[PDB]
Nucleic acid binder design. Structure first.
Lengths: 99, 55, 219, 108, 84, 97, 279, 96, 93, 98, 97, 78
DNA sequence: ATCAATATCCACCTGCAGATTCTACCAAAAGTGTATTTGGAAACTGCTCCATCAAAAGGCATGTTCAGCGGAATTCCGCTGAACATGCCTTTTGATGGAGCAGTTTCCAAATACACTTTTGGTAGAATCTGCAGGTGGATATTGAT
DNA sequence: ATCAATATCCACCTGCAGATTCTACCAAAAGTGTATTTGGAAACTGCTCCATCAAAAGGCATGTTCAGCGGAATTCCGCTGAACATGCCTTTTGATGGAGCAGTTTCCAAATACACTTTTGGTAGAATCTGCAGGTGGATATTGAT
């Protein structure tokens, strides 16, 4: 009864994990907002050179501000999958004690 | 004037760096696709599923 | 009122769908403990007048951490130890085999991500990352007279916690073994794939920003 | 003060003695306590003081100053707690409650 | 004397049972229910008057009264009030 | 010259009859029927008038309950007319044989 | 009878001082002092007052930990379960029993579900209320213990609280029911909603309605609808049918709908209702 | 030339419960029949359960469960509450 | 010591056709019959005694109780054998 | 000489004496003629055990079963409504197709 | 093998179940259900197993009489399939409340 | 302790004891409701009897007395 | 909608049985004080019976497609109750007789009550044998696509 | 119209459960012999009260036409029985704990039975003032042709 009944708690723990992955659907849906804006932020940089200083030096504030919002979805996507993954093998280590 | 010669090495380092980052840009297509082909194992209910968000 | 002097520093985000965050509060804010002002008025006012180390506040986070990691789950049978401190050879595999609540899991995935420019940079860790230096590195050089932090500490709490505390069969059954284990194996390939795009995201940022500013002396 | 010991000591308005001797009459067994018959008094009273108080609520809504036998059954049958204490009972000249079901008049 | 009478189950008339149905609430009456509702009326009358005449048979009363027929009509599970 | 719709005077006599509570069947024919159903039991039985009135309103009660039964039966049988089989089911299900 | 005295002098959480109301066997290290601080988005109580210079820097989570069901233009609703999340189920009770009359740490906090009443605030979703949920149909009691924080009481939240809990009775498709045994200052507001849902859903049909179908869309227990007869014309036909019909009334509740019937809940949200044989 | 009835007592019940309401003699007989047969019903059920308990004396608890067992719900609970009230109130043997 | 009519109804089957047999549930159903119909006619007879302002539980009131308590032809055969056997009991002085 | 055999019956007067007596209300019974009901339980118990032999050779059974009891304790339309609320335990019903 | 018309095997198990006098319902969930109906009226009172068998004899007698009467109601409805309004008319014409 | 009001598809055995044809859907909820009603009535009567006896174990005599009042003789069992 | 024709509510009315008080009275119970004999209450004591509890072989409940026949919507068409006139049958009402019912009193027969046997009638034992449930196996319907 | 694999009816066997038949203890109500005791079957009368009867309007029987509805039948679709594979709670079987039975002994509350003597509650009437009940008219709502 020891290497069997704990598998039911594995079910309920990763139960909200696809809904957690459904929260990533907003997060990967958030890449529609800014990576297309990444295509559209380019139009005020190369078109303003024009066969060669407030638009060349201070233009980094339009670039440095955008890298903050991409990171919250990035690394947090990993560790949730890790606790979707890695905690099973400690229970498998209980299952490895028998067949 | 050897000043901009060694200063060009601060920007020639990026162009050898340019090839390895564009390769990672060039490697994007199959790793999106071959995961999605692996994901087919059914009718692809959406169109922009995980990494077709990028263009 | 003075209760809202410096509220908290932070900006939130809005939603477009339903927020779905099923996590653990014991793993949300990370570390468990904290200390008060009466512990550094001896060190930073009477001891550090001629010392060589430069004392920082971020080191207080992970400071006691390796000492309560052995006292609870590595040996639980103590209850009322008067001198409640296990000795130096009982604290030598603590810092070497540093199990800071599974420190390996929080870093072993990023190796095959190959994002070794930074480490562990996530939003759920707070935004003060520049002062982060692990005391698995910072004991043998600067934390030598800080290594004895926990040994004094349980004496004035009488061997107890500094915070308060609340009042205290195989056949026809083996088919869901591989039906449950293999399904969550495939999630690593999801994470490893979406890591590589968020790697090359930031690698696309540092392309031109150090190029064109140099052009004022070469063209 | 007052010392009228006519067994209104219970504060009950029915005779303790008449239903005492009627219990002593009905009496399939052998004995019957008058002191444990005082509870049997108000069982009868609550049967009545909640029946007929509920009755004369029709006298307001139908503007009668007496209460007569169709006024009994017309409102002694609406209270479903006091319904099934009369299911064996048939009130003489009591009439029927007005009851036309909706599918009878379908505007055909 | 004897004073015999021919049976007159047709004494209850057509508009009488019509009015008795319209007390109940039926809006459309058949043409052939008449004799059979006469039949069930006669069955109910005989089922109650057997008990009435056996109560007045034990009572040593060669009349009938109201109290014995309300007793007899009580013991058919359809108890009547008002008349005792 | 003037004539109502068919079926609308029926509800008028419904409300006229059930609003009031007088005895419905005529008194002396039912007295004759009680004596004629009595005469085969014991010859020449004397009757009490209040007992005959008790029979009047008792059989009025039972027959109006039976018409309520057949109204239920005919409104379940997707009809608006009652029939013989409605009374047959009413007698069968109310319980007496 | 044990908690008829006071335990802390005053307790704060965020912006508003809360002079408490009920005793509880807390550690005495809380009761030696005056200022007791409570961390806002997570409620994990603080025996010391000298950590907001670093704990607000250590404050990692800003949205309160439940799962989003529906947010209107003003207020949202969240979802916390005990077996999958124990720690925030702990500190929910330590602020509840300060206000309540029923709690006892007797069983474990696992089986009974927690919902939340937190408003759209510009400094992150501050919580203003929370109401309990039993797992499944133990003694009826389909809605459960309800708290409302006096930092934001008497400003028109509690009616929106109780109807949203009642709003989840219909997708449950079951008999909605309160915990009966005690309520005094809430019970008249509890009885208000059954009177509020009385005439408003009644006139929208414009005809009569049959007694099971009252229990269809109102989804309350039939003892309440039977006890709603004392306010209205629920009159009882031939062998018990209890069915109702509209009478022309004052309808001043239905006429003056300006400020007291301020907001309601749009039925646009999702539910799980997890079936698990563990109890 | 003798009869027993409950006439003036139910008339006093009407006087207490309503300030003015008349009763016809037909309605007096209706209510007298109701009180007499509900009397008989609870009496024979109480005696029947007294035999079924193999006791001999009829007392307040068997007629209490007779009240509780012969009726439907809410008038039964109000009736047994009124019965307990009345038996406790009779129990006080005092001057006033 | 419990009282049961089982031996007596066994002797009733003995005084009719002896080839047949009572089982352990058949005498339960038969004892329930005899006790139930006994209870019914006894309460009817006592109630009729009270109704007729009369004291003794007469044989005449058992006569009228069995006449009113049964359906027809069963009642007339039962009362025929009843009056037969009670005049037989009065015969042997 | 006898006990109640001088009545010619089988059941005893003495058991039915007190069972009339302690069930009674009217305080006095006719102890010499309470045996008229002693007659009636014989006709009661014979008639619904004589019909147990109404189907002897057409059931092929020696003991009296409780389905053997009920399944012909209904054909007696006279004794049908004498047991109109009787629920024979594990007796089945009678076979019928409408 | 071959498969006979639908309905015929249903009628032969009508016959096979109606001849038998076995206790048709399963005993131990009925024990469960009588405990379930017990604890809401009173705390833990004890049940003799013969008395639970007595309930397990009585309640399905009430159920089969209900089924007989609703069969006759549906065959009055000129159909061979019972419904919810059939059992409503059976209870209401029974005089159930 | 839990809810076990789900009985069985022996409703399609008890109907089979009746002379019924093809049954329907949407009757099983009503038949378990009316079973709940009949059992709660008779168990309320039985618990009043065994409460008056002040025995904390019920007996078959209690249920036969309760049914014998209630309108149907639980016949040949006590 | 817009009137025509009833119908219903809404007073207003005067007379008529009928509720209402009510005094008398007189049986006629109710209440009161006192032994008193007994039956409920209670504490206690064997114990039989009932409650969980786990494990092992298997009927059987559960979800499955799936094909079909039974429910149901809508059509149309004869007929039978329904609305109303009217001609006519008999119901509703005040006086006259006889017997049945209510009542009084009488022996007087039959039943309580005591007290002393004793067949009889439960019960636990206990053989026993025999009828019955179940099993196996053979004879005779059983109701379908082609 | 026919040949079929399924199922039922019949027949012999065989374990085995329990129904039958004494049977003895045993003890217990049933029978019996008076003795006293009161309710009751029977006889006589006063008197309601219930038959039993002859003279006037209200309802009942019997028509009419007429359109609203009960049934026939089509038609179509969808719920619902019907195997069929498969999980799954079962069904005894045995055992442990233990506790609420049923029974003894007991003791004192208390209900019965008095008689006294009380106010006191039906009640026959008896007056006596009436609420209500059918009728009469007037304001206004509820179906039916245009």
């Amino acid at each position: 009864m020891d290497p069997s009944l704990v598998l039911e708690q594995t079910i309920q723990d990763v139960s909200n994990l696809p809904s957690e992955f459904r929260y990533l659907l907003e997060e990967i849906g958030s890449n529609d907002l800014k990576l297309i804006e990444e295509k559209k932020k380019y139009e005020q940089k190369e078109s303003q050179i024009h066969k060669f200083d407030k638009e060349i030096k201070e233009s980094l504030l339009k670039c440095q501000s955008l890298q903050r919002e991409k990171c919250v979805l990035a690394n947090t996507a990993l560790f949730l999958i890790a606790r979707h993954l890695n905690k099973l093998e400690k229970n498998i280590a209980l299952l490895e004690e028998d067949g | 004037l050897k000043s901009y010669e060694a200063l060009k090495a601060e920007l020639k380092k990026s162009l050898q760096d340019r090839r390895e980052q564009e390769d990672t840009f060039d490697n994007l297509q199959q790793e999106i696709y071959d995961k999605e082909t692996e994901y087919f194992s059914f009718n692809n209910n959406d169109r922009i599923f995980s990494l077709s968000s990028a263009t | 009122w003075n209760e809202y002097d410096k509220f908290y520093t932070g900006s939130f985000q809005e939603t477009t769908s339903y927020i779905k965050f099923s996590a653990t509060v014991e793993d949300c804010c990370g570390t468990n403990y904290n200390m008060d002002e009466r512990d550094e008025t001896f060190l930073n006012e009477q001891v550090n007048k001629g010392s060589s180390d430069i004392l920082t506040e971020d080191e207080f986070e992970i400071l006691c951490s390796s000492f309560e990691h052995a006292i609870h789950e590595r040996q639980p049978f103590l209850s009322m130890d008067p001198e409640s401190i296990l000795s130096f050879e009982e604290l030598k595999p603590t810092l070497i085999k540093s199990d800071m609540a599974d420190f390996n899991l929080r870093n072993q995935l990023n190796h095959e991500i190959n994002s070794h420019k930074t480490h562990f940079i996530t939003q759920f860790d707070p935004v003060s990352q520049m002062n982060t230096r692990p005391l698995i590195q910072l004991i043998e050089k600067f934390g030598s007279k800080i290594y004895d932090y926990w040994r004094e500490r349980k004496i004035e709490v009488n061997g107890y916690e500094i915070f308060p505390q609340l009042k205290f069969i195989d056949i026809l059954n083996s088919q869901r073994l591989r039906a449950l284990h293999q399904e969550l194996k495939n999630a690593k390939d999801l994470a490893l794939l979406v890591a590589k795009r968020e790697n090359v995201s930031l690698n696309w940022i540092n392309d031109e920003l150090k190029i064109f500013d140099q052009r004022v002396k070469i063209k | 003060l007052r010392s009228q010991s006519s067994s209104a000591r219970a504060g009950l308005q029915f005779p303790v003695g008449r239903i005492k001797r009627y219990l002593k009459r009905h009496a399939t067994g052998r004995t019957r306590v008058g002191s444990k018959a005082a509870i049997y008094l108000t069982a009868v009273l609550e049967y009545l003081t909640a029946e007929v108080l509920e009755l004369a609520g029709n006298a307001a809504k139908d503007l009668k100053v007496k209460r007569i036998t169709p006024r009994h059954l017309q409102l002694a049958i609406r209270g479903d707690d006091e319904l099934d204490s009369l299911i064996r009972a048939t009130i003489a000249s009591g009439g029927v409650l007005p009851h036309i079901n909706k599918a009878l008049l379908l505007k055909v | 004397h004897r004073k015999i009478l021919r049976d007159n189950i047709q004494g209850i008339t057509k508009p009488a049972i019509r009015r008795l149905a319209r007390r109940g609430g039926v809006k459309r009456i058949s043409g052939l229910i008449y004799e059979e509702v006469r039949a069930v009326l006669k069955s109910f009358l005989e089922s109650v008057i057997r008990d009435s005449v056996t109560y007045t048979e034990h009572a040593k009363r060669k009349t009938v009264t109201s109290l014995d027929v309300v007793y007899a009509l009580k013991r058919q599970g359809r108890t009547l009030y008002g008349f005792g | 010259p003037h004539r109502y719709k068919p079926g609308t005077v029926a509800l008028r006599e419904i409300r006229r009859f059930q609003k009031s509570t007088e005895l419905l069947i005529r008194k002396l024919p039912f007295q004759r029927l009680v004596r004629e159903i009595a005469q085969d039991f014991k010859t020449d039985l004397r009757f009490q008038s209040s007992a005959i009135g008790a029979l009047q309103e008792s059989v009025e009660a039972y027959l109006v309950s039976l018409f309520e039964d057949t109204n239920l039966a005919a409104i379940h049988a997707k009809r608006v007319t009652i029939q013989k089989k409605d009374i047959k089911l009413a007698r069968r299900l109310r319980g007496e044989r | 009878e044990v908690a008829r005295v006071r335990n802390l002098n005053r307790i704060i959480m965020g912006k508003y001082e809360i002079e408490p109301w009920y005793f509880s066997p807390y550690p005495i290290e809380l009761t030696d002092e005056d200022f007791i601080y409570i961390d806002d988005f997570t409620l994990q109580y603080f025996g010391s007052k000298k950590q907001y210079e670093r704990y607000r820097k250590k404050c990692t989570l800003r949205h309160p930990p439940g799962n989003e069901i529906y947010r209107d233009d003003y207020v949202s609703f969240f979802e916390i379960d005990g077996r999958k999340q124990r720690t925030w189920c702990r500190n929910l009770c330590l602020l509840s029993k300060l206000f309540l009359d029923h709690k006892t740490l007797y069983y474990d906090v696992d089986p009974f579900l927690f919902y939340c009443m937190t408003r759209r605030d510009e400094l992150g979703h501050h919580l203003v209320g929370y109401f309990s949920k039993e797992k499944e149909s133990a003694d009826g009691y389909n809605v459960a213990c309800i708290l409302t924080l006096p930092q934001y009481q008497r400003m028109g939240y509690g009616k929106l609280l109780i109807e949203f809990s009642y709003e989840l009775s219909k997708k449950e498709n079951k008999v909605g029911s309160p915990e009966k045994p005690l309520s005094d200052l809430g019970l008249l507001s509890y009885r208000a909603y059954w009177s509020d849902t009385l005439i408003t859903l009644l006139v929208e049909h414009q005809k009569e309605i049959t007694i099971d179908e009252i229990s269809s869309m109102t989804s309350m227990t039939t003892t309440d609808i039977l006890h709603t007869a004392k306010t209205l014309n629920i009159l009882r036909y031939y062998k018990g049918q209890h069915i109702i019909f509209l009478n022309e009334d004052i309808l001043d509740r239905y006429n003056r709908l300006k400020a007291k019937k301020r907001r309601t809940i749009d039925p646009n949200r999702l539910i799980w209702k997890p079936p698990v044989f563990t109890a | 030339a003798r009869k027993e009835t409950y006439s003036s007592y139910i008339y006093k019940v009407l006087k207490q419960t309503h300030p003015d309401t008349g009763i016809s003699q037909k309605s007096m007989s209706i209510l007298n029949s109701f009180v007499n047969d509900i009397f008989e019903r609870i009496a024979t059920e109480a005696s029947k359960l007294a035999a079924y308990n193999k006791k001999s004396t009829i007392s307040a608890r068997e007629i209490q469960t007779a009240v509780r067992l012969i009726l439907p719900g809410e008038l039964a609970k109000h009736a047994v509450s009124e019965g307990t009230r009345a038996v406790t109130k009779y129990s006080s043997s005092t001057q006033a």
